[PDB]
C-alpha cells in the first residue's frame with residue numbers, strides 16, 4: 067500500500083514543529099531509497115497507523131498534546147448530582163410478583179438481544195499467566211467464563227444468537243484455541259481484535275521505542291469495541307439480501323436490526339453476576355424507556371469502581387448522565403470547601419452516587435444511531451504514572467486510553483433517556499485481585515474480589531436462588547477454609563451446579579421446573595449436586611456427592627428422579643499449605659490463585 071515516496075513525506079511531516087519526532091531518525095540517511103530494512107519497517111509501522119488510528123500517527127501525537135495538557139490541570143465539574151433516572155432492582159433471592167414479572171419480561175427480551183464481551187485485558191496482576199476467560203467460574207465443574215457466557219447466550223437466544231468478543235494481541239490466539247478445545251459451535255460469533263497504540267516516552271509526546279529499537283505499543287482500553295463493531299461486516303446469503311457476489315459490505319449492526327434484534331448488552335470478562343442482572347435490566351429499560359442503562363451497585367467510598375452521576379463539565383454545558391471513574395472522583399472529593407454541597411457522606415456508609423459495574427444495556431436502534439454519527443469514536447484520556455511527586459518524568463511510557471462506557475456522553479438529555487439500575491452488591495462478583503492484594507484489602511475492611519471469593523460467591527448465588535423457590539437448604543455461614551496466611555475464610559458447600567440445559571435461563575420459574583416439589587428434596591450442607599442435561603428432581607435425600615446426567619438436547623424428554631437416596635464420602639476442601647514443596651505437584655496457577663483445592667473423593671452418577 068505505501069510507496070517509498072509517501073514514506074519520505076511522512077518522515078518529513080513528523081519532523082515539523084508540533085510533532086518533533088526527529089529522535090526516531092537519528093543517524094538515518096537523507097533519502098528513503100538509502101534506508102535499511104528496519105528503518106523502512108518503522109516508517110511502515112507509522113504509515114499504517116493512519117489506517118488503524120484516526121488521522122494516523124500525526125493525529126495521535128496532536129491528541130497526546132491536548133490530553134497531556136488536560137491531565138496537568140486539576141479536574142473540575144460545574145455540577146455533580148444524582149442522575150434523574152434511577153430505579154431500584156428487587157432482590158434476586160425473593161420470589162416477589164415484581165421479581166417474577168421483571169424476570170419473565172426480561173427473559174422474552176433476551177430472545178432479541180445482541181451480546182458483546184470485552185476480553186482484551188491481561189490482568190497478570192492476578193498471578194494467572196493465561197487469559198481471564200479461561201479462568202473457571204468454579205472448580206467443581208471447571209466451566210470457563212468463556213463457556214459460561216456463550217452457553218447462557220445460546221440457551222436464551224438460541225444457537226444462532228449474535229455474539230461479539232473483543233480480543234487483543236495478548237488474548238486473540240488463546241481465545242480462538244479455547245473456543246476450538248471446548249468444541250463450542252456459535253454460527254453468529256464475531257471475534258474482533260483491537261489494535262495496540264503507540265506510547266509517549268515523555269510529556270512532549272515523543273514516541274517511545276523498545277529495547278530492540280521498535281515502537282512500543284500498549285492497549286487503547288475497552289473503548290475500541292464501538293469502532294470495531296462500526297467497521298465490522300458480514301456477508302449476505304440467508305439474510306434479507308442474497309446477492310451472487312461475495313463483495314458484501316453489510317455492516318454487522320444492519321444484519322442485527324434487519325433480523326429483528328432490539329437490544330445490545332456489553333459485559334466484562336470475569337463477572338458471573340451479569341446472567342442475573344441482565345434480564346431485570348432489560349425489563350426496566352422497556353418499562354422506563356431507557357436508551358442506555360448502567361448496571362449499578364451501592365458503592366463504598368474507596369471502591370475501584372466508577373460512579374454514575376449527572377454531570378456538567380462547564381457552566382454552559384447541558385446535563386449529561388455519565389460515569390465518573392474512581393480516580394477522578396477521589397480528586398474531586400479531596401478538595402477545599404466553598405464548592406457545591408453534594409459531597410457530605412451518607413448515614414449508611416455508601417457513596418452519594420451509585421457504583422457502575424460496567425454491564426451496559428442499550429436499546430439497539432438508539433445505539434446504532436449514535437454509533438453511525440460518531441463512527442464508534444469515544445472521547446479519550448491519558449493517565450501517565452510519574453516517577454516522583456514532582457512529576458516531569460514517566461516511570462513507564464504512557465499511551466492514550468478510552469472507556470466503552472464513555473459512549474454515554476454522546477447521548478444528550480434532549481434526545482435520549484440514560485439511567486441506572488441498582489442491584490445488590492452480592493450480584494457483582496468479579497475476579498480482579500490476587501490473594502496478596504486480597505489480604506491487604508480485607509485488612510482495611512474492603513472487598514477481596516479474588517478467585518476464592520468469586521468461586522464462593524457463585525456457590526452461594528445458586529443456593530440463594532434455589533432457596534427463593536422453596537428448596538430447604540440448611541447450612542452454616544461459618545467458613546470451611548482459610549486463605550492468604552489465614553487473613554480471611556470462605557465456605558463452598560453445599561455445592562449445587564446446574565448446566566444451561568437443566569436450569570435454562572436461570573430464572574426462578576426455570577429453576578422451579580427442575581424442583582417442582584422442592585419440600586421433598588433434602589441436600590445436606592456437606593453435599594455436592596452436579597446436574598447436566600434435561601433433569602427433573604422431584605424427591606432426593608443426598609449425603610455426599612452426586613452427578614445426574616440427562617439428555618444433552620433441550621427438546622428431548624426429561625430424566626425424572628424420584629425417591630432417590632444417595633450416601634457417600636462426597637467431597638472436601640483444604641487449604642494449600644505454605645510449605646508447598648512443588649515436587650510432583652499437580653497444583654496449577656488455577657489452584658494457587660484461590661488458595662484451596664477441592665478433594666473429589668467420592669461421586670455417585672445417575673445416567674439415562
Ligand SMILES: O=c1ccn([C@@H]2O[C@H](COP(=O)(O)OP(=O)(O)O[C@H]3O[C@H](CO)[C@@H](O)[C@H](O)[C@H]3O)[C@@H](O)[C@H]2O)c(=O)[nH]1
Nearest residue numbers: 184185186187285286287288334335370371372422423424
Ligand atoms: O484494552 C482493553 C482493556 C480492558 N478490556 C476489558 O475491559 C474489562 C474491564 O477491565 P478491568 O481492568 O477489569 O476494569 P477497569 O477498566 O479498570 O474498570 C471497568 O470495570 C469496572 C467494574 O469492574 C467499572 O467500575 C469501571 O467503570 C470500568 O472502567 C475486561 O473485560 C477487560 O478484558 C479490554 O477488553 N481491552
Ligand code: VO4
Nearest residue numbers: 284451462463464
Ligand atoms: O502497561 V501498564 O498498564 O503497567 O503502564
Ligand SMILES: [Mg+2]
Nearest residue numbers: 188283284285
Ligand atoms: Mg503493558
